Structure 1
């Protein structure tokens, strides 16, 4: 159940499969830096409130740590450490010159005001200014954090360091040194993963019977992108049930201005089949509605030749093993959702250079990077006769382990 313990376990099995001693696991299981700070913030009522903040750095052997910051009241040291490890895994998978980093603050932005949030971000930056920077630790946004907060953090760090430091933090607006493609990063990444998986298999993108459990934001975006060439069969889990069931029919482009807040696309009173439809003889599957939708009971029921994960923990180990035995391709979420990290890396590169690219350049570089990562993972998985998830984990930890061994820490 413990997220940290689960992460340590997956790291352990990946290292064991790669054939590394136990000291490598002992080093990589726990981050080498965990800073806990107390931030005094003056609220709009004249009172002073003490906020708790955490910053975890996992490994700097490969390069400066890269990590997001989340403003949530349920953050914890264990969660921050686990997320730092996961970020390190993603960076290793994409072959970035980054390490694992993460940050968090115990707060409720829904209750906090604009000025209060600005003061809190500035105080957090002031507190952690000693162990962060463009060469040590690069923050980024996460849940309940956005470009305004990133800009405030950038301003505070620039004031501290007496010069502009755009590359210290990513996720900034364009005027302050932002990068294009930030919004569509994850959806684009899943699209490239799907295309490369289809190319590796014998499936083409013309028919492309696609089942999606999304239809919300990312699901709608990927469905729209697929609609140009492929087709649709059924859409599930639209926050109300199986409201969409074309069953062999396509959907007109309806991405102009529509949201699930009021109805889904046309009307909420349309015919509804049931909550879970699944099944059907499709060739592409995109499950992203909730955590752990696929279980042992329904593992054999699905009839999709390719499955691409777009959410966090949509499948279990038993389901992954069943799909691998059935020879159904399964793209891990850790690889599918790396577009945001890749775009943040591009923004960091642009800040370092002083030259800012265009949307086309960002798209082509993202395509190259994700295609290379997918090919490496697929080849290694075939060579080792293992599953894609384990292959991705081993690819992620290999860079960190080799860097540590080369530098002599183990």
Structure 2
């Protein structure tokens, strides 16, 4: 119901009041415990509001010869860690308050997955369906030009990212404009933006990054007995029914990695309909069907579902579409026990209250929806390294692994007086695939799993410390606030 800007400030104030006394304890300045609380409450007053907001009004020229002035905004919430990171939205519904809110969310999201980026967010007020491809390029490049001279884009100041109505195509124009004009003398000019194509300096494994992040986000809690015991489910993914809402980029890879581990997708719903099949839906069949006709309506191996996709009887619900889809109205009717927020703030704070009362696990967005942001940090490092991950180590590591297995083979053959080839030590079926198909995608996906797993322990620890139970969101915001605070406190 309420605007998202009202939500993030409420999440911050709730986490700031809980972590306040622990910040004063671990703060070891040369003051008494009364002045230290003034510093804690003083630093928290700095982190909460956005530091910089650039309102723009640049002109473009349409193909018909007409003139048009475009309106755009970009907010930098925190500068405690440079550069700033965030997406760019090309919608009509974009406002400044909505930009400052998602900019603050990016700050706390980056801190959860231990990504050293300040939160940022951008948005121009156009509808891309009303502009041609050539017109969209002039809007993108000119927007990049105006952000560059005002210090709102660059490899060490602000690194934008894709968002709604924005893909890798816009990121190419953004990196190309900066690398040819203001940042021509910058050796890392192509690190000014992420989400780029592989040809323009992108990283492998980016398309399925956010989808793999929501899988490892559920997996880290689906395999913990203490959390599954509070619900009525056994640990594991076998015979787990999950519903995907919004068959977009995240929803496509979310169901593919859940179906891979034994989970059965019983329903997928978008804005134009919802299909249903309690015996499972093949992700590959639905992906090829979505590509052909641009909609999941009329799937052969499924039946139309004339009802709310969020109220389907299931175990896991994955909202991966629009904002505020679970409010005080439909939340008391949700049958799922685990809610994985594949989108940015799809649950109202009032629905969070009854979800905690109904004993329903809600994995928060600032942790679970950070898979793409994690490898966006990896793409930024890749452009700084000027080389793909594993380019210099793949053959070196592969030869070392074959040396290790051969050392076991020869040592055992010599121990028992057998000639060569008698005791073959070969990699397993899984190890052989990880060796032959070794690519940069393999390293960034394992690095994403390491980040999502390690962040899950930090959330489980502080939630268990403050007896927050199934309130994963509060425990997540307490982790982010405490991390940003230590950067401010230990600096002066």
Question: CA–CA distance in 2 between the matches of 1:276 and 1:154?
Answer: 39
Question: CA–CA distance in 1 between the matches of 2:325 and 2:163?
Answer: 24
Aligned pairs for 1:268-307 within 5 A: 270=303, 272=305, 274-275=307-308, 278=311, 280=313, 283-288=315-320, 291-294=323-326, 302=334, 304-307=336-339
Q: Which residue number corresponds to residue 192 of structure 1? A: 216
Aligned pairs for 1:235-384 within 5 A: 235=267, 237=269, 239=271, 243-246=275-278, 249-252=279-282, 254-255=285-286, 257-259=288-290, 261=294, 263-264=296-297, 266-267=299-300, 270=303, 272=305, 274-275=307-308, 278=311, 280=313, 283-288=315-320, 291-294=323-326, 302=334, 304-357=336-389, 358-384=440-466
Provide closer, same or farther for how the CA distance between residues 364 and 298 of structure 1 changes in structure 2, counting only shifts above 3 A. same
Q: Which residue number corresponds to residue 170 of structure 1? A: 194
Task: Calculate the TM-score normalised by the size of structure 2.
Answer: 0.75
Report the more deviating stretch, 189-198 or 126-135.
126-135
Question: What stretches of structure 1 move > 6 A for 4+ residues in a row?
Answer: none
Q: Which residue number corresponds to residue 400 of structure 2? A: none
For the Cα contact (< 8 Å) 1:213–1:237, is it kept in 2?
yes
* Structure 1 residue corresponding to 2:240, chosen from 201, 209, 212: 209
Q: Which residue number corresponds to residue 165 of structure 2? A: 144
Report the more deviating stretch, 359-368 or 49-58.
49-58
For the Cα contact (< 8 Å) 1:11–1:25, is it kept in 2?
no
| Residue 72 in structure 1 maps to residue 91 in structure 2 | yes
Q: Which residue number corresponds to residue 8 of structure 1? A: 9
Q: Which residue number corresponds to residue 119 of structure 1? A: 138
Q: Which residue number corresponds to residue 489 of structure 2? A: 405
* Structure 1 residue corresponding to 2:109, chosen from 90, 94, 101: 90
Give the C-alpha shift of residue 289 in structure 1.
5.8
For the Cα contact (< 8 Å) 1:57–1:101, is it kept in 2?
yes
Provide closer, same or farther for how the CA distance between residues 255 and 47 of structure 1 changes in structure 2, counting only shifts above 3 A. closer
Q: Which residue number corresponds to residue 254 of structure 2? A: 222
Report the 3-state secondary structure (helix = DSSP H, G, I; strand = E; otherwise coil) of the residue aligned with 1:149.
helix
Provide closer, same or farther for how the CA distance between residues 258 and 68 of structure 1 changes in structure 2, counting only shifts above 3 A. same
Report the more deviating stretch, 88-97 or 53-62.
53-62
Q: Which residue number corresponds to residue 475 of structure 2? A: 391
Provide closer, same or farther for how the CA distance between residues 125 and 294 of structure 1 changes in structure 2, counting only shifts above 3 A. closer
Provide closer, same or farther for how the CA distance between residues 209 and 24 of structure 1 changes in structure 2, counting only shifts above 3 A. same
Q: Which residue number corresponds to residue 60 of structure 1? A: 79
Largest Rg, 1 or 2: 2
For the Cα contact (< 8 Å) 2:244–2:265, is it kept in 1?
no
For the Cα contact (< 8 Å) 1:213–1:289, is it kept in 2?
no
Question: CA–CA distance in 1 between the matches of 2:460 and 2:357?
Answer: 16
Question: CA–CA distance in 2 between the matches of 1:273 and 1:112?
Answer: 35
For the Cα contact (< 8 Å) 1:209–1:230, is it kept in 2?
yes
| Residue 33 in structure 1 maps to residue 44 in structure 2 | no
Give the C-alpha shift of residue 143 in structure 1.
1.4
Q: Which residue number corresponds to residue 17 of structure 1? A: 18
For the Cα contact (< 8 Å) 1:234–1:245, is it kept in 2?
yes
Provide closer, same or farther for how the CA distance between residues 119 and 256 of structure 1 changes in structure 2, counting only shifts above 3 A. closer
Runs of 5+ consecutive residues of structure 1 not aligned to the other structure: none
Q: Deviations over 1:272-292 (max 9, x none)?
A: 464458464x54443446654
Question: CA–CA distance in 1 between the matches of 2:453 and 2:61?
Answer: 48
Q: Deviations over 1:172-196 (max 9, x none)?
A: 1111110112211121111111111
Give the C-alpha shift of residue 309 in structure 1.
2.4
Runs of 5+ consecutive residues of structure 2 not aligned to the other structure: 24-39, 229-233, 390-439
Q: How many residues align?
A: 405
Give the C-alpha shift of residue 315 in structure 1.
3.1
Provide closer, same or farther for how the CA distance between residues 138 and 236 of structure 1 changes in structure 2, counting only shifts above 3 A. closer
Give the C-alpha shift of residue 243 in structure 1.
3.5
Report the more deviating stretch, 208-217 or 84-93.
208-217
Give the C-alpha shift of residue 293 in structure 1.
4.7
More helix by share: 2
The RMSD of aligned alpha carbons is 2.7
For the Cα contact (< 8 Å) 1:212–1:288, is it kept in 2?
no
Give the C-alpha shift of residue 56 in structure 1.
1.3
Question: CA–CA distance in 2 between the matches of 1:162 and 1:206?
Answer: 50
